[PDB]
Write a protein that binds this DNA or RNA. Structure first.
Ligand SMILES: OC[C@H]1O[C@H](O[C@H]2[C@H](O)[C@@H](O)[C@@H](O)O[C@@H]2CO)[C@H](O)[C@@H](O)[C@@H]1O
Ligand SMILES: OC[C@H]1O[C@H](O[C@H]2[C@H](O)[C@@H](O)[C@@H](O)O[C@@H]2CO)[C@H](O)[C@@H](O)[C@@H]1O
Lengths: 436, 411
DNA sequence: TTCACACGTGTGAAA
DNA sequence: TTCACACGTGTGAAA
């Protein structure tokens, strides 16, 4: 619960929350307002649950794709930056946080996956996914692997699924069509099949998660990983000399990562909107604010023009934005969470052998497009069955009371119904078969 | 490939492996789930208290100390090999607090003194009842009373005057804003390691991260409550072999010949301290560390955790009681009353679930066949589409009943 | 779109 | 122990 006079921030555990706390300390030193930064697990899921009742942090950080669902649920304050401040950030980052014509968060940085490779183990990274199996065969002879990345979050395999034609929601006529899902087309199946076949041919393992891949690459056991700018800090501290380059092609086509804009939304229930707004506009989104976060864990391409023009000189940022250009900014519509849940199930089930590729993507197709009933539709259904049971209960109450049907002391309603049927000239077998 | 909890020295055990490991979430919960399908680990490490429920469900010599073996044995058999003895201790910042408090009762006044300097007195994980149980047991609270050579499931003490007094004091610390109900492991560790809070409660595994920080810390006895010692539940980190593992003795020799060495326990121990290890050879060296001396001084005023299968229901019950009372969702009396009831709660067997599933399937099939027959041969004056309640009404009127709109029925 | 029966488990009865 | 109606949501029909 937000208490007035201080700020509590939620940011994911892979970002530079220690650097962000340093910005919080400067804010506390100038205005007196205490700023606490926390990184709980599954925070993008926890926020919509607690924020609906007015709980949750003052400020929540996540990629922009989750915020439109938050805004639709009335969990976010509208962001009211003056025009002079809006111009300090790239226009496309503001677009990422615009929903129903209103700005619902401050954009922070642009995130895109890249290929990260070990220069010493592999001076020339592969340009295509197709040459990965042969490469791993060649590295397995020296006790190494070619490629390990997180297969528990669909974010990391989506560039491959999208390469030959898979997509989330088709953009048409200025809008995303929530009924036009492309996780089931030929391109998506081609990309996921190539992933599943790397697993079947023992080039990757289906249970590899984030920490396994990160540990493997930074210990020098795999030649390549796929990860974002936040991951560069831990590689720097390791004994691995790495490079950041474009993702491999698949069927001669570029991998298309879904591009995220790390964003900071303000809780609609916060009694500290202006202090939150002041912290974000005049402390975080400054050169010095972003620098403190970025030196903890790299942010990627920051939305603030002044600081990005220094970060853009870094060849790792150049590669990041090269992959970003080949990808697409994620939608922010509320249906994105249902899309992500569906594809997560599909990748894990197909990587696991629990479902075929076609069956997994077929189910993900319908789940991502499924119409979610509103609270009122749910309540209508709940009341209809409550009423149906209520009418039945009164009928059987009356039948038991006045029937004198020659029944055992404690019998179910089916027995009462049977006694009623026989009274009306019917025969009811034990299994329920009924006729006159 | 082996499962160890993410707060232990998994890198230190990985270094043992290379000369010869993953840290999942909720591993203690996942293993009973994935064993029933033959999935899971070769070897699972956890405190001994969970292994009896495992042994009851069938999922699993003198170098090591005698009592460490007793903790990992259930039904006359030995289900894991003990590695280390764990007890919580009070960890304190010497620079902020040269003289740590010896009672819980003086922590409120201390926190008011520290709040004026921008600090707090105490932060520790309030989401896991392991960390609050020492205070709950101080004035008399207990899990299952040991009597007559066994733990009695009919004598549970999470609801007595001592337990209430401990939880009431904890809740009062929160209501007087000396602690926050939502403080978890990560928040408490960060605050202490950054020098923001004067004290924390944690085990030996946490010492490594404090060493990495700039905080001069000491480890000492937990504070008393009502003049009585804090009584932590003492855990023996143990090593069970999966009953379904095809590599049992290849894993067993890894246990005895590579892990439980001094070279290898050392190697894990320098990653994150294990506590008082079960191996005597190496324990004589670590025993001279004053932090280990403090750990076992807390351990002797505590009790060894039971390993009986009810421990899971006990911990779950206690965990929701603490969270519900901390947050204000339940009063202390109501929260512990619910915990007392649920601490021994029976879980229905698979077959019992299946009995219920089949019974209701049969109930619906009998009704469905009655209404199918009525619709087919009734030739009732029903609408084109209507529910079975409408058929039932039409059957009632045929038998000489009248049924009102809402279902009130009479002759 | 609304709607009905299915579905497995919850609450608590009867013993 | 077994048992039965309650319970809200799933599946899929009818429109
Ligand atoms: O995997 C689905 C997941 O993808 C994205 O999450 C990214 C996030 O954008 C990055 O900042 C980083 O934390 O990696 C995450 C994947 O683990 C979406 O932003 C998220 O909504 C979605 O669930
Ligand atoms: O909080 C309930 C929990 O307590 C113990 O868990 C300890 C564990 O023994 C330690 O090794 C360390 O991991 O901290 C844990 C608490 O977060 C019991 O072992 C466990 O069964 C119980 O659920």
């Amino acid at each position: 619960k937000i208490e007035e006079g201080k700020l509590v921030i939620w940011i994911n555990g892979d970002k530079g929350y220690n650097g962000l706390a340093e910005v919080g300390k400067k804010f506390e030193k100038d205005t007196g307002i205490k700023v606490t930064v926390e990184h709980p697990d599954k925070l993008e899921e926890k926020f919509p649950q607690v924020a609906a009742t007015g709980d949750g942090p003052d400020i929540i950080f996540w990629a922009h794709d989750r915020f439109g669902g938050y805004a639709q649920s009335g969990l976010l304050a509208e962001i009211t930056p003056a025009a002079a401040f809006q111009d300090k950030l790239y226009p496309f980052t503001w677009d990422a946080v615009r929903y129903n014509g209103k700005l619902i968060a401050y954009p922070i940085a642009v995130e895109a996956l890249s290929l990260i490779y070990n220069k010493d183990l592999l001076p020339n990274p592969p340009k295509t996914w197709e040459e990965i199996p042969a490469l791993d065969k060649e590295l397995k002879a020296k006790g190494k692997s070619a490629l390990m990345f997180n297969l528990q979050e669909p974010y990391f395999t989506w560039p491959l699924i999208a390469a030959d034609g898979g997509y989330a929601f088709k953009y048409a006529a200025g809008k995303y069509d929530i009924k036009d899902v492309g996780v089931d087309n030929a391109g998506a199946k081609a990309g996921l099949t190539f992933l599943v076949d790397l697993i079947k041919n023992k080039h990757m393992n289906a249970d590899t998660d984030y920490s396994i891949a990160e540990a493997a690459f930074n210990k020098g056991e795999t030649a390549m990983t796929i990860n974002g700018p936040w991951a560069w800090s831990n590689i720097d501290t390791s004994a691995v000399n790495y490079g950041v380059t474009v993702l491999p092609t698949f069927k001669g086509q570029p991998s298309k990562p879904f591009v995220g804009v790390l964003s900071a939304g303000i809780n609609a229930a916060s009694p500290n909107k202006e202090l939150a707004k002041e912290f974000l506009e005049n402390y975080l989104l400054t050169d010095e604010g972003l620098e403190a976060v970025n030196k903890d864990k790299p942010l990627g391409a920051v939305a603030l023009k002044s600081y990005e023009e220094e970060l853009a000189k870094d060849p790792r940022i150049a590669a990041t934005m090269e992959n970003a250009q080949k990808g697409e900014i994620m939608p922010n519509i509320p249906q994105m969470s249902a899309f992500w849940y569906a594809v997560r199930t599909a990748v894990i089930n197909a990587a696991s052998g629990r479902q075929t590729v076609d069956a997994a993507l077929a189910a993900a197709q319908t789940n991502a497009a499924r119409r979610k009933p509103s609270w009122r539709e749910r309540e209508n259904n709940r009341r209809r069955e409550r009423r149906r049971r209520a009418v039945a209960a009164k009928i059987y109450t009356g039948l038991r009371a006045q029937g004198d049907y020659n029944l055992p002391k404690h019998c179910d309603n089916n027995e009462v119904l049977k006694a009623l049927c026989v009274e009306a000239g019917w025969v009811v077998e034990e299994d329920g078969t009924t006729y006159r």
